Amino acid sequence: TVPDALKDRIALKKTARQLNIVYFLGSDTEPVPDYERRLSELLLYLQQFYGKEMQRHGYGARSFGLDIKSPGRVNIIEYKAKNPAAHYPYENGGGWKAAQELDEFFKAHPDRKKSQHTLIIMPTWNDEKNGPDNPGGVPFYGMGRNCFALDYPAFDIKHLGQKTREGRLLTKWYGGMAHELGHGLNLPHNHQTASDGKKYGTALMGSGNYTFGTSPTFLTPASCALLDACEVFSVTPSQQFYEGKPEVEVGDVAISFKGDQILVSGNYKSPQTVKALNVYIQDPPYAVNQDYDAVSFSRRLGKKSGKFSMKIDKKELEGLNNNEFRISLMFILANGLHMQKHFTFHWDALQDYRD
Ligand SMILES: *[C@H]1O[C@H](CO)[C@H](O)[C@H](O[C@@H]2O[C@H](CO)[C@H](O)[C@H](O)[C@H]2O)[C@H]1NC(C)=O
Ligand SMILES: [Zn+2]
Ligand SMILES: [Zn+2]
């Protein structure tokens, strides 16, 4: 009743809001056997992974909330859809269709909604391409505060780390679920620093979907700073999330280059508390699936207005190899919204930036 991988687990702070878990079934789709137990186990270990990383970065034993209905069992919403599986494929807006339909279900059942974040899980298609040994066919990506992942018969934590085909399949699809969940929890892509790579392995939001459960995987300081401001990590029930717009005035921005150091400073002002500053440094190009290389850094602010100052060591920018690079400054607000300002430089014509 408790798998070995969960015998080592920490007590977590109760949260104000919980991630919804939906097991989403096409009108013609059969559940994968034993999914309540298998998925509860995988989700609780996932909750442990995020909570231990939050703790290791100084936030205490905080993870995303889950609605737990009895020991070791997540209260998973089993949703029978209006249409057959074919109507919600990986391609062509299948994920938007499922997610819009679940909105109707949550309007019709507000008691089942515990936050604005949902992980929708669909059983693998079984056809000439996909099946138990090669799952796929369904949405598998982040979509706003929602994210999509899949289930298949060997999707079972007992295979975690085993040097077998089931174990390798698990790291692929469990790492996959972990990464897409990161997106649903307001995480962008980021790459580990050089020192963090040697200490802790692969950033989950970089290439960690290939490593989770097999070699060391972790959450960066910047990832944890965003989770710190994510609705389902809240231990503060008075705090409302995602309403309105990010309002931050950033002024007196300076970025200067001195020897090996990158100096970043400025001031900020917001009607909300500004929790933190994340900095992303990356090579071009800069699109949303071309930023696995953005090496991130983070600093605690914690005021509605003030100054920020930060020295970044150039030698930590592991993997960057372009003459051209971009520094992004990300201001994270207490209600989970954020704003970004971007700056482009060239290493062979490095120009300090002012104003
Ligand atoms: C990214 O890695 C994932 C595992 O970590 C996974 O392989 C994903 O691939 C998609 O999986 C979907 C599951 O329904 C579909 O089968 C889809 O066709 C397939 O590409 C990987 N993404 C990409 C873009 O390859
Ligand atoms: Zn991604
Ligand atoms: Zn890039």
Numbering used by the authors: 27 to 381
Tell me, in the authors' exact words, what the paper reports:
The strategy for capturing a native binary enzyme-product complex was to perform co-crystallization experiments with full-length wild-type OgpA in the presence of the GD O-glycopeptide substrate. The overall architecture and the conformation of OgpAWT-GD-PRO were essentially preserved with respect to the crystal structure of OgpAWT1 (r.m.s.d. of 0.37 Å for 344 residues) and that of the OgpAH205A/E206A-glycodrosocin complex (r.m.s.d. of 0.42 Å for 353 residues). O-glycopeptide product was unambiguously identified in the electron density map. In contrast, there is no electron density for the 1GKPRPYSPRP10 peptide, supporting the notion that it leaves the active site immediately after the proteolytic reaction takes place. Specifically, in the OgpA-GD-PRO crystal structure, the O-glycan is found above α3 helix making interactions with residues of loops 4, 6, and 9, while in BT4244, ZmpB, and IMPa structures the equivalent loop 6 is shorter than in OgpA; also loops 4 and 6 are far from the O-glycan-binding site.
Here we focus on OgpA from A. muciniphila, a recently discovered O-glycopeptidase that exclusively hydrolyzes the peptide bond N-terminal to serine or threonine residues substituted with an O-glycan. OgpAWT comprises two domains from the N- to the C-terminus: (i) a catalytic domain (residues 25–262) followed by (ii) a β-sandwich domain (residues 263-385). Interestingly, a Zn2+ atom coordinates with the side chains of three histidine residues, H205, H209, and H215, a highly conserved triad among metalloproteases. A glutamate residue, E206, is well-positioned to act as a general base/acid during catalysis.
